[PDB]
Design an enzyme around this catalytic site. Structure first.
Site, PDB file in Angstrom:
ATOM      1  N   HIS A  62       0.839  -1.211   0.000  1.00 25.23           N
ATOM      2  CA  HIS A  62       0.000   0.000   0.000  1.00 25.23           C
ATOM      3  C   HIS A  62       0.867   1.251   0.000  1.00 25.23           C
ATOM      4  O   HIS A  62       0.433   2.318   0.484  1.00 25.23           O
ATOM      5  CB  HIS A  62      -0.923   0.014   1.255  1.00 25.23           C
ATOM      6  N   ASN A 135      -9.962  -2.912   3.472  1.00 29.21           N
ATOM      7  CA  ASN A 135      -9.756  -2.908   2.010  1.00 29.21           C
ATOM      8  C   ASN A 135     -11.111  -2.631   1.316  1.00 29.21           C
ATOM      9  O   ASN A 135     -12.157  -2.667   1.967  1.00 29.21           O
ATOM     10  CB  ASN A 135      -9.195  -4.264   1.527  1.00 29.21           C
TER      11      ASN A 135
END
Ligand code: HDD
Ligand code: HDD
Ligand code: HDD
Ligand SMILES: [Ca+2]
Ligand SMILES: [Ca+2]
Ligand SMILES: [Ca+2]
Ligand SMILES: [Ca+2]
Ligand SMILES: [Ca+2]
Ligand SMILES: [Ca+2]
Ligand SMILES: [Ca+2]
Lengths: 319, 673, 672
Positions: A62, A135
């Protein structure tokens, strides 16, 4: 707020060192007008040392992402289901910071890569910071954390040449998926439009795991977090996402920045599915298994509160 | 080459880092559905490693790729430099090179418009020597203390970190317009040199004046120029943008593939050599890194051959970890008082502390020299050596006076050129000899062909139209106008401002050789160039035509891709994954004419590949004899330069290969009147 | 072996940079001979950057210590009790490295502080590195790893002024001991001579925790590790240790270095107590409790092998400072137990190496490398020294043909958790009631000491507690000591002007146990390496002859002999100015030097006599060979460990028995 206290204003004033001595920073000190630069030039070295040390390691996953500040407001006193203080009164407001991201690409990779996206939310509660690191897809590729480096090595670039960037479109990724069948559920999600959302504002957030809500009397229930977009769900099409990656690598972070500046800060209903402990295996799968959803037909959503993002950061690095 | 440090995992059971055999697939739990245990060392060692894999990216040139190779000297250069790697005809020295963009982060696209890095390490028999250069021979700024100003201005705005890998924003153009030294590099970056076709099709420059120093102490002033043996070539902007999305890895893939196919790139390593007395003789100051020496004043001398011919084994260990320094200097070379070079010497030793996390970064395999090390540096985090000498101080008697001091007269020591002096006040002042920021940008502009000048104008029109501040746009026009009134008028036209009145102080009509890409003539080799053959599975004859063409094209070292609707023997790529940015020329087999709707690719895809290739200037054609259906659909004229139609495969290929060497058909681009 | 490959020789050659370019490093580059230094001087900056970055964080505990290399040799094939490969054959040899240490002091503090001492051993086995990270005391202060920062903050210097260095003699420490009664057992050990050993070679090593031996069939037994010194047990006396801390802060590291160099490398028998899983609670305490010993009466020692240290390091920083021990370094055939102190240590030692090394590749430092091939998918990280050829480092894969293979109980000699182990019950942050007796074993330990040894322990407590400022902390201390022994509490209270609380007999008893007394452990088995100071004079040729004849007689028996006189010359090793009784295990005056014991610019007033008198007061064998000297010193001739002989050979036979006896404890006053 810890942030206001640490803001530094440079709209006026003379240049200073980091210890408050007024200086200049435009010409090096030299032995003669066409001479060599002197070691005693502390103005030069303090400025260049800072610059030389500006970077920190990117996140291991990420690394590409963007954040905003906002508020969470509770709809009710939820004491009947949890002792959580931020949920203990109708109208109770808690500051939040959210960062959205892709997963596999390095920090300068394109927003519109096909990928699973992060949606990480910090609630600065009056009984401590509470993070839900979620997510945009409600299930994960693997069933045990010890496998995470295997998954991630396989989707990140091949390690001899570091190709390809921010893509599962290579042999190692499909080798892993095909050898590790738990990956199928998330793979299907990532191969759908959920892999290429129109914006951070047009996707949901999921805690993925079953957690517990615990009351003060010690009793507990099993929960799933679902942040439901008030903007609706929308995706790109793949040929469009590819062109966008080249034409504007910053598309999602710009979309978010602009929506906030125009007074259109995005909103989500923060929800849970809530079931009894005795139902851990009642739905035809195990609630400990992060590759499974609870179908909404078996457990409806309860709306706990409103998440709204409405302020951009002041310094992207610092925040 | 770094064979001694390789670790093979092609056999064996999994072990910890201390060689205990283990497993790493399931956590240890209290019961089959229980919580994970803190005593699971297998879990924690593997995850701790993963948690700490990343290191900070380079502060600049974060996006790049490297390869190993060899440098071979063409002569004994003893008569101009004491440098050992240059001391004998045919003497070989291992090298490692990393190429890069400058502004973008890790993962940003190879095909951003930018200045590119070209950093070369020579592992010489008298120490590592690095030349840390760029593909553009001049830099934006005249003093190293300004580097953070330049870099902050061109990197993303720091409130929102937008935009990635781009000078197309207000802060960059604010800086350029307020700091007029930037004009020369800016004109280079706005030309095709900002978007090279590959790392193999660009040159390398040291940028600064350095010194060659002979063993007798005499010195000469030099400029390094690494001249590509592949030719010079660029992309067009509109193609670069699409490629940035379709293949962010385009340059690194191009280099990797060229090496794997036995087509490792080459450069002649050259210098311009001039006397110490000529430092101010050419109408500018050789200490000024914003100036070139026109080749009409000092020709290039070829010193040797640089060839890259081996790819790394592990990108992180080799390419990511390689830590260049201009302070990695060897006897026979010295610095000059260029204030940009001077400050670099500090930065590159300091910044490796940030990257490596500790002081022993010269110990990583890729950074080690190939000769022994004798010094009294000790300890520090990550110390890999076990030093025998228990008296690491000078002067000593207890280690018999070793290591011995090396200098001009003993031990082949490095020595500062002994004719160098300084005089005058200690000052933070800029030499007035640096003040002409505009004549050389005009020299450069004058030296480009008309379509090349248009491309540069169009890059400026593109970027400046994205600048929101009308005050910045006006200030930009002010500066461009000092270089060229015509540039200023033409750029202004796109942003709906008026250019300011002509200011002729720096205007002139001089030109110089060797800076134009369009004018550098056909490529000297077409090996590695990419040809896409658009075919169909509908007709077994189209596949046959494609197979015939492949054989004839591959024989000449071209990389051929046959594209069809679906994969099968002989077909490399589907239409869904194909794009014109993937090819240097495009051929349609006439059996596939019908394709020019399916669930197997986006609508219009086969035609779009052909139309894009045409509009971007590439050689295009139809092989087989029936060409009008395809050419009409694409709105391509059959009589066009770089447009081929032949029935004969052999004849088609002969003509088409001349087109691949021309590379770009510039007559397809509109010019301002 | 990885060690030999990374040695760098600088006995010849020209100075070079770290990238092999020959340079100089004695004068800075300047603009003119009296000018400013130039930024382009890369010789200066690379040298000074390295210097500026030489230091790394000291270890959070055991920062002061010293290491050596050696060998372990197995006495048997131990497959009957463990799968461990290093224990699988008679005579099987495994290289080792051992570091010894104090606990509280920072890296420059004195070796002879009163403290618990570390004894950490790495076996570089043919199935992976195995570390036993132990101490010289068999029990620990606390019963749960989460309490470690509390213990350590309390014993380390007060954090406003960082006073006092390397000492429990301050309010915070005694506050903690008095509030956390689990501390009593280790506290009594540390207040005994075990807190001030004579050397690292004269102490034992203990794993402290119960571990498991696991057989290839998967069956398990419980074990305690005990490394038994072949040099014997010996201590300093406190006053001596105090002086030594000032005269020679390096005393223990010097002693070890010197013993190795002289071919007298120290030895231990590596032993275990072995008991069945069913005996976890059979001995009147819980084997999961790290504050308890198994008395040897209940479980004898089995000798597994010989540990010998016989080679000093080449570079202290690269070897001793950088060695990074972990109890997580375990091998097939050993397993953990649910001791809550051990359980949390497993986390700390992997984490803390990131602080020390500054990056994740610390197992790549030569001292930390294994001696067998490494096969795994750990990649990248700062300071990565490998170039990995496997370009598919994930499992499961086909692209690297499924390599590396998973190792486990069945395949590839994998580590495996003992398969008999289970867990049951609620997830709790609760202490087992089986841990609650904090006082019976400290009493067992105390009971087992000889009377003079009990006095030394009472006196160490009197010393430290008298320095506690808070009267409430002192009272609270007496409350706890009283639960171990009323008599101890009474005798300590007398020195601090407080009354002891009334007897509380809940945990009192009269049981003793073998093997814990130093004074009771009998004469030393060897006197090799012990130090004899001969106090001589340059003023009499007769004195130097006497000294020389004695030297040759003592040196042949492996004694380290120092002849002391006013000034150096042939035959004289040290001046009176630099000499001290803490420098010797025995002191002899040659009678020709009689006059020196009755002023000189060459040494401080009364120095020769004070060396003799200190040595006597501290219990050492003392002698005059040739008395006026014994009278000046107030030393009675008939005293045990006092020697008077005109004969050289009769003096030396007698004196050497005294060195073996080591301390003459009749010279120390007892309470009552
Ligand atoms: C055992 C390793 C491991 C596993 C199994 C996961 N992650 Fe993770 N994750 C990390 C190890 C990690 C990390 C290496 O610790 C990161 C990198 C940066 C950071 O703060 O934590 C991280 C970062 C990270 C971020 C970025 C937060 C930010 O914006 O700064 C998000 C959104 C997620 N993760 C979400 C997930 C989800 C929804 C998971 C499955 C349910 C998940 N991770 C499994
Ligand atoms: C005073 C600061 C400063 C100035 C004026 C410059 N640079 Fe620089 N450069 C650095 C500070 C720096 C740095 C921060 O030290 C970097 C980042 C990573 C590194 O190793 O050094 C770097 C990296 C770096 C790289 C990447 C090397 C690699 O591939 O690892 C190249 C090619 C250049 N630079 C080239 C130049 C050229 C041709 C310059 C002008 C002639 C220049 N730099 C001026
Ligand atoms: C949970 C924290 C914790 C606990 C309960 C313990 N330790 Fe520890 N120990 C550490 C945390 C630690 C550490 C912070 O992780 C150190 C510092 C340096 C290092 O490598 O590990 C350490 C160092 C260290 C050393 C020095 C190793 C060397 O010489 O480099 C020894 C000998 C011990 N310890 C021994 C013990 C014993 C015998 C314990 C009780 C049975 C014990 N430790 C409990
Ligand atoms: Ca791959
Ligand atoms: Ca869709
Ligand atoms: Ca801007
Ligand atoms: Ca061009
Ligand atoms: Ca010199
Ligand atoms: Ca205190
Ligand atoms: Ca004692």
């Amino acid at each position: 707020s810890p942030l206001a206290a640490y803001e530094v204003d440079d709209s006026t004033g003379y240049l200073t060192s980091d210890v408050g001595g007024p200086i200049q920073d435009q010409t090096s000190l030299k032995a003669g007008i066409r001479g060599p630069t002197l070691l005693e030039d502390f103005m030069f070295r303090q400025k260049i040392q800072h610059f030389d040390h500006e970077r920190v390691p990117e996140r291991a996953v990420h690394a590409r992402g963007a954040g905003a500040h906002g508020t969470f407001t509770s709809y009710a006193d939820w004491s009947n289901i949890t002792a959580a203080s931020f949920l203990n009164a109708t109208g109770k407001q808690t500051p939040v910071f959210v960062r959205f991201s892709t997963t596999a690409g390095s920090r300068g990779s394109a927003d519109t890569a096909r990928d699973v996206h992060g949606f990480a939310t910090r609630f600065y509660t009056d009984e401590g910071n509470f993070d839900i690191v979620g997510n945009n897809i409600p299930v994960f590729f693997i069933q045990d954390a010890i496998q995470f480096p295997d998954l991630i090595h396989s989707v990140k670039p091949r390690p001899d040449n570091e190709i390809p960037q921010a893509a599962t479109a290579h042999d190692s990724a499909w080798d892993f998926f095909s050898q590790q069948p738990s990956t199928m559920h998330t793979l299907f999600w990532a191969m759908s439009g959920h892999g290429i959302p129109r914006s951070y504002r047009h996707m949901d957030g999921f805690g993925v795991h079953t957690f517990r809500f615990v009351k003060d009397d010690g009793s507990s229930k099993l929960i799933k977090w679902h942040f439901k977009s008030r903007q609706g769900k929308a995706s790109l099409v793949w040929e469009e996402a590819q062109v966008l990656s080249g034409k504007n690598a910053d598309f999602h972070r710009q979309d978010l920045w602009d929506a906030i500046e125009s007074g259109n800060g995005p909103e989500w209903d923060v929800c849970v599915q809530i079931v009894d402990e005795s139902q851990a295996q009642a739905f035809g799968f195990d609630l400990l298994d992060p590759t499974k959803i609870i179908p909404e037909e078996y457990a409806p959503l309860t709306k706990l509160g409103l998440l709204k993002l409405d302020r951009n950061p002041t310094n992207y690095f610092a925040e | 080459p770094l064979a001694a440090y390789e670790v093979d995992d092609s056999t064996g059971y999994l072990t910890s880092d201390v060689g205990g055999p283990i497993q790493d697939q399931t956590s240890l739990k209290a019961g089959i559905r229980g919580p994970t245990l803190l005593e699971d060392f297998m879990f924690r060692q593997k995850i701790q490693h993963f948690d700490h894999e990343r290191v900070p990216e380079r502060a600049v040139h974060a996006r790049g790729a490297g390869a190993h190779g060899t440098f071979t000297s063409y002569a004994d250069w003893s008569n101009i430099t004491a440098a050992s790697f240059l001391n004998a005809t045919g003497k070989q020295t291992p090298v490692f090179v990393r190429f890069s963009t400058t502004a973008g982060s890790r993962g940003s696209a190879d095909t951003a418009r930018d200045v590119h890095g070209f950093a070369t390490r020579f592992y010489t028999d008298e120490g590592n020597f690095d030349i840390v250069g760029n593909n553009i021979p001049v830099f934006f700024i005249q003093d190293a203390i300004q580097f953070p100003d330049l870099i902050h201005s061109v990197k993303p705005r720091p409130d929102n970190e937008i935009p990635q890998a781009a000078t197309a924003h207000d802060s960059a153009w604010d800086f350029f317009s307020q700091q007029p030294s930037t004009m020369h590099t800016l004109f280079w970056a706005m030309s095709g040199h900002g978007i090279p076709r590959s790392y193999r099709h660009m040159d390398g420059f040291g940028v600064h004046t350095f010194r060659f120093v002979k063993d007798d102490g005499s010195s000469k002033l030099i400029k390094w120029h690494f001249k590509s043996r592949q030719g010079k070539a660029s992309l067009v902007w509109e193609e670069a943008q699409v490629l940035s999305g379709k293949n962010a890895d385009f340059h690194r893939q191009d280099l990797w593939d060229a090496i794997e196919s036995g087509n490792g790139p080459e450069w002649d390593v050259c210098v311009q050599i001039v006397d110490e007395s000529q430092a101010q003789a050419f109408g500018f100051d050789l200490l000024d890194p914003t100036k070139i020496i026109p080749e009409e004043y000092a020709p290039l001398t070829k010193l040797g051959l640089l060839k890259l011919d081996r790819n790394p084994t592990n990108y992180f260990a080799e390419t990511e970890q390689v830590m260049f320094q201009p302070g990695h200097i060897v006897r026979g070379i010295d610095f000059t008082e260029d204030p940009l070079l001077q400050g670099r010497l500090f930065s590159y030793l300091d910044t490796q502390l940030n990257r490596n996390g500790g002081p022993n970064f010269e110990q990583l395999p890729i950074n080690m020299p190939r000769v022994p090390i004798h010094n009294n540096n000790r300890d520090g985090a990550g110390q890999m050596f076990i030093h025998r000498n228990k008296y690491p101080y000078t002067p000593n008697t207890l280690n018999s006076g070793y290591p011995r001091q090396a200098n001009q007269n003993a031990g082949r020591g490095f020595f500062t050129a002994p004719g160098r002096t300084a005089s005058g006040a200690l000052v933070r002042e800029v030499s007035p000899t640096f003040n002409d920021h505009w004549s050389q940008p005009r020299l450069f502009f004058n030296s480009l062909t008309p379509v090349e000048q248009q491309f540069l104008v169009n890059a400026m029109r593109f970027e400046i139209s994205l600048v929101k501040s009308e005050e910045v746009k006006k200030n930009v026009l002010t500066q461009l106008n000092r270089v060229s009134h015509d540039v200023a008028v033409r750029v202004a036209a796109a942003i709906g401002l008026g250019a300011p009145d002509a200011d002729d102080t720096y205007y002139h009509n001089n030109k110089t050789a060797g800076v134009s890409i369009v004018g550098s003539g056909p490529l000297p080799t077409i090996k590695t160039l990419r040809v896409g053959i658009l075919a169909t599975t509908s007709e077994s004859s189209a596949l046959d035509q494609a197979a015939q063409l492949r054989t004839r094209l591959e024989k000449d070292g071209l990389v051929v891709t046959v594209v069809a609707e679906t994969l099968r023997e002989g077909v490399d790529q589907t239409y869904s994954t194909a794009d014109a940015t993937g090819f240097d020329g495009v051929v349609v087999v006439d059996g596939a004419a019908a394709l020019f709707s399916s669930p197997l690719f986006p609508t219009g895809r086969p035609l779009q590949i052909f139309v894009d290739a045409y509009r971007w200037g590439k050689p295009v054609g139809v092989c087989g004899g029936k060409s009008s259906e395809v050419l009409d659909a694409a709105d391509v004229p059959e009589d066009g330069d770089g447009v081929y139609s032949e029935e004969s495969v052999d004849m088609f290929v002969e003509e088409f290969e001349k087109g691949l060497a021309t590379f770009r058909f510039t007559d397809r681009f509109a010019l301002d009147s």
